[PDB]
Amino acid sequence: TFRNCVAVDLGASSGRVMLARYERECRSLTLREIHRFNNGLHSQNGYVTWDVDSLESAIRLGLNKVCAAGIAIDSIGIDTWGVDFVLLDQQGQRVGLPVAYRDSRTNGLMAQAQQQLGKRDIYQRSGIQFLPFNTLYQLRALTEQQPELIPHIAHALLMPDYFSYRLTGKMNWEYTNATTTQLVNINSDDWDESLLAWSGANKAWFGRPTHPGNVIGHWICPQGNEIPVVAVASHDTASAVIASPLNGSRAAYLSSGTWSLMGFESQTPFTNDTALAANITNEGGAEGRYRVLKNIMGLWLLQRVLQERQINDLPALIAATQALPACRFIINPNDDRFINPDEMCSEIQAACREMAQPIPESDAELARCIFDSLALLYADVLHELAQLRGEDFSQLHIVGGGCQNTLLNQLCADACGIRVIAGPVEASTLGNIGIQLMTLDELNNVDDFRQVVSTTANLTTFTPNPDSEIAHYVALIHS
Numbered sequence: 001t002f003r004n005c006v007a008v009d010l011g012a013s014s015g016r017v018m019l020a021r022y023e024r025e026c027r028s029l030t031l032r033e034i035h036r037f038n039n040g041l042h043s044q045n046g047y048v049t050w051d052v053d054s055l056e057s058a059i060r061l062g063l064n065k066v067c068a069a070g071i072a073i074d075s076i077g078i079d080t081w082g083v084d085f086v087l088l089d090q091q092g093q094r095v096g097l098p099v100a101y102r103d104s105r106t107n108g109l110m111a112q113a114q115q116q117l118g119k120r121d122i123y124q125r126s127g128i129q130f131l132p133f134n135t136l137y138q139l140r141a142l143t144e145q146q147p148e149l150i151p152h153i154a155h156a157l158l159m160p161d162y163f164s165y166r167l168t169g170k171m172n173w174e175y176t177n178a179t180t181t182q183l184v185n186i187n188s189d190d191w192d193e194s195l196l197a198w199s200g201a202n203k204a205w206f207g208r209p210t211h212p213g214n215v216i217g218h219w220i221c222p223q224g225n226e227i228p229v230v231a232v233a234s235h236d237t238a239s240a241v242i243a244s245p246l247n248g249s250r251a252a253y254l255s256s257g258t259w260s261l262m263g264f265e266s267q268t269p270f271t272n273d274t275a276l277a278a279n280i281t282n283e284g285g286a287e288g289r290y291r292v293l294k295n296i297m298g299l300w301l302l303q304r305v306l307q308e309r310q311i312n313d314l315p316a317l318i319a320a321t322q323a324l325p326a327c328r329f330i331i332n333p334n335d336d337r338f339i340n341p342d343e344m345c346s347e348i349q350a351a352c353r354e355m356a357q358p359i360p361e362s363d364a365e366l367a368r369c370i371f372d373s374l375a376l377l378y379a380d381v382l383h384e385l386a387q388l389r390g391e392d393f394s395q396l397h398i399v400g401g402g403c404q405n406t407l408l409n410q411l412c413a414d415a416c417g418i419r420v421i422a423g424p425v426e427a428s429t430l431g432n433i434g435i436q437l438m439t440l441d442e443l444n445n446v447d448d449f450r451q452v453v454s455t456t457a458n459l460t461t462f463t464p465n466p467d468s469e470i471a472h473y474v475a476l477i478h479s
């Protein structure tokens with residue numbers, strides 16, 4: 001009566017196949033890693049792409065490991081990073097390259113859309129934040145720059161649905177991730193005809209978006225037994241929010257990985273002029289609970305620094321960084337210059353120099369700049385969100401790999417002046433498992449699932465310190 005559910009969670013920096021064991025009567029939820037594998041950008045023929053074939057093989061390797069162990073798999077579910085897609089021909093073969101959202105093909109196109117359609121028009125239709133790599137702009141790039149591919153395209157699948165298709169042979173268009181495209185009309189939960197038209201994409205390439213929980217199809221162990229593949233809240237951030245142990249209207253989340261996604265949950269979207277000016281997004285959530293959030297460039301900046309300076313001990317870097325004084329180097333991490341510069345360290349240094357600040361040069365200084373700059377932006381955004389909804393927050397839940405950074409957890413609490421609760425680490429995996437359990441009739445809703453997480457996961461409390469360096473800094477930049 002315990003259920004064995006497999007979650008595939010693909011992030012920009014890593015993929016993971018994990019196995020959960022759940023039994024309702026016990027309120028016991030355990031999670032084991034089956035297969036962890038690298039993911040990251042590839043330079044391929046002058047483009048920045050994903051190696052989808054290696055990701056698919058890695059997923060299969062993990063699934064086949066569970067099968068060969070003789071475990072009765074009750075379900076499988078897949079979540080990935082948002083926005084990106086794979087084009088398919090009439091026989092399901094890939095068309096063109098699997099270009100990544102970090103690619104520069106889209107440069108200038110978001111401004112073009114605003115000029116031709118109207119910024120307010122796009123925002124009112126979609127309720128989605130302006131990011132220059134939104135799918136809306138990617139499809140414009142594709143149809144403009146690669147017209148010869150167009151007749152060959154039968155379907156476009158967002159990344160999670162692409163892998164679900166490779167496992168089942170069936171196509172799906174999952175709602176929570178569909179909303180990341182800036183192509184879904186917020187009033188209809190269906191593709192917006194005017195936005196599709198501008199992109200050059202064909203409505204026939206898609207299907208009506210379907211809310212999480214449906215059985216997409218089945219996958220088969222080397223044995224022959226049919227295992228349902230479930231559409232989960234397939235946008236990784238949507239899954240992370242599900243597993244965040246939010247406690248009522250006064251709780252916010254910070255989903256911390258490659259990106260930092262800071263937001264709250266709402267029954268209704270915010271598309272007013274305040275939201276528009278703040279560039280706030282209203283992403284689709286399980287249960288129709290909007291994820292009202294902002295993208296923050298996040299630990300991407302550090303990932304790049306680590307590779308450039310050949311740093312292989314991140315815990316040591318964090319410990320060293322703790323000893324450096326705070327707020328000497330402040331950049332705006334959300335500046336477009338940081339999306340994909342060739343030289344991240346140089347870009348951070350240039351930004352600091354431009355602002356008449358000392359230059360962060362040691363490994364620990366670069367890390368310090370990143371952590372303080374993120375924490376100040378966290379405080380800015382949390383303020384914007386509270387102001388927008390007309391309600392303060394009493395706790396901030398930090399989840400994701402980033403929630404292991406105890407330095408950044410405390411900086412966030414101190415800058416925001418809010419209690420921080422860190423954990424679970426693998427929130428996307430857990431929310432993916434949650435929806436699967438719901439389709440199995442083992443769990444009733446997201447709120448019930450969060451009660452499980454809160455009695456199962458390791459949660460660490462960071463109390464705001466009013467006398468901290470960053471708290472003192474924030475106090476000064478108010479008056």
Ligand SMILES: Nc1ncnc2c1ncn2[C@@H]1O[C@H](COP(=O)(O)OP(=O)(O)O)[C@@H](O)[C@H]1O
Nearest residue numbers: 011012013014256257258299400401402404405
């Ligand atoms: N032991 C650790 N201590 C502190 N931070 C960590 C640790 N392990 C990983 N991280 C942070 O977590 C990030 C990865 O978070 P994750 O949620 O897996 O990202 P993705 O968005 O790629 O799925 C890494 O870039 C790193 O900054």
Ligand SMILES: C[C@@H]1O[C@@](O)(CO)[C@H](O)[C@H]1O
Nearest residue numbers: 080081082083236237259
């Ligand atoms: C493309 C970006 O990647 C994420 O899904 C985080 O992995 C984020 O929510 C999107 O904006």
